[PDB]
């Protein structure tokens, strides 16, 4: 570059040559001199020069605007509402295309987070990911994806491309562990059980039309055929697909990770998995 040649010509760069980028350092304004002194920009007498003007929102005694408006339950229970980060099929296809999400293996929340396709904040009442139909008309990826919510159209697109989608619930603790497993493994605790959905969410995850992970698998072919009929595509028989085993793999309802069972301890330091053998512990972790 010509800039480096200019450097070669110029004096040595040292700590005596350094200057901040112009425009990055505003001058400091302080109350000395004619223009900034005297009353120092505070006005003349009154509470505003004395520095004691009333609180924010006080209107001089008139009933404040923010108090004369009636209370309404706009934000009632806001902190207990479940939140689901949207994952559009556009974003999913983008991730698959750039190789940040491998469709050759089951796609769950862990894989999405590892590919950085979605950011989950369990502390902010994120209960997982919801599939979003946006980008359905251009989705051309065969994928086995596990999500928490799924729109009918998103399910239709996933299935038309020959893939499988299942809606799986996660309690806040299991969700935290799934999103960031490595910190959990460093906590040194046995992998906990995945709790069941709350009573209100039970019907959703037991319904086959949602591909609920607790729904009767006998009803899945009927629902898939119904979607294929409704949206005018021929349902591909995934059993014939050479990735049928992958498309079928589903973690157990009480399982957080695909190949790890509740109660196991992951010793990452020496690449081992300690498994309890006590009958009571095994019964607990299987229940």
């Amino acid at each position: 570059a010509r800039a480096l040649d200019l450097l070669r010509g110029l004096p040595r760069v040292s700590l005596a040559n350094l200057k901040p980028n112009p425009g990055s350092k505003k001058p400091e304004r302080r109350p000395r001199g004619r223009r900034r002194g005297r009353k120092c920009g505070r006005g003349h007498k009154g509470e505003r020069q004395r520095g004691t003007r009333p609180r924010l929102g006080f209107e001089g005694g008139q009933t404040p605007f923010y108090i004369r408006i009636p209370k309404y339950g706009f934000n009632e229970g806001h902190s207990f509402r479940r939140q689901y980060k949207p994952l559009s099929l556009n974003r999913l296809q983008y991730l698959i295309d750039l190789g940040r999400v491998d469709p050759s293996q089951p796609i769950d929340l862990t894989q999405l987070v590892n590919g950085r396709g979605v950011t989950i904040q369990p502390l902010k009442r994120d209960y997982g990911v919801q599939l979003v139909e946006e980008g359905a008309d251009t989705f051309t990826a065969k994928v086995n994806i596990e999500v928490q919510l799924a729109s009918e159209l998103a399910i239709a697109a996933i299935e038309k491309n020959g893939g499988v989608v299942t809606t799986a619930f996660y309690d806040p603790r299991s969700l935290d562990i799934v999103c960031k497993p490595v910190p959990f493994f460093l906590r040194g605790q046995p992998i906990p059980k995945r709790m069941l959905p709350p009573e209100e969410l039970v019907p959703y995850y037991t319904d086959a039309k949602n591909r609920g992970y607790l729904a009767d698998p006998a009803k899945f072919p009927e629902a898939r055929l119904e979607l294929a009929r409704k949206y005018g595509y021929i349902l591909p028989d995934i059993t014939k697909d050479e990735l049928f085993k992958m498309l079928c793999t589903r973690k157990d309802p009480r399982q957080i990770f695909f190949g790890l069972a509740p109660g196991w301890v992951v010793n990452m330091a020496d690449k081992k998995i300690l498994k309890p053998t006590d009958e009571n512990l095994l019964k607990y972790y299987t229940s």
Binding site: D216, P217, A218, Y231, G232, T239, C248, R250, P253, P262
Partner: protein, 127 residues
């Protein structure tokens, strides 16, 4: 593989085979579907009504009568949906319209009525 008391096999013992979850009327091959990215897109479904063997003959006749306004000069019924940004939903609407037309075939106008009545009242001259 791990299995808990809530495993699917235990929950629904009747359906336990893996193939049970994946074991599979308008002919989509017979229909001709086109998409126009016209904001909502548009999906057009057109099919030759007369040669629609998948539709009964009386149903074809009743459709050709009731919906003659949607039939091209080539005798092909054309119908479109433009009510969604998703061509999936547009095509779904078109297919549902086809189904509704078949079902109904199986089983402002006030001023027009008045003016036609007046035409018939004026209809008095006989060669």
């Amino acid at each position: 593989e791990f299995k808990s008391i809530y495993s699917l096999d235990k929950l629904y013992p009747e359906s336990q085979g893996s193939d049970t979850a994946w074991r599979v009327d308008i002919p989509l091959d017979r229909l001709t579907i086109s998409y126009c990215r016209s904001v909502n897109s548009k999906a057009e479904v057109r099919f030759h009504l007369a040669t629609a063997e998948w539709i009964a003959e009386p149903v074809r006749q009743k459709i050709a009568i009731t919906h003659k306004n949607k039939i091209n000069r080539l005798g092909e019924l054309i119908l479109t949906s433009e009510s969604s940004r998703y061509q999936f939903r547009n095509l779904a609407d078109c297919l549902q319209k086809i189904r509704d037309m078949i079902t109904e075939a199986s089983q402002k106008l006030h001023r027009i009525r008045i003016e036609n009545m007046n035409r018939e009242r004026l209809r008095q001259k006989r060669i």
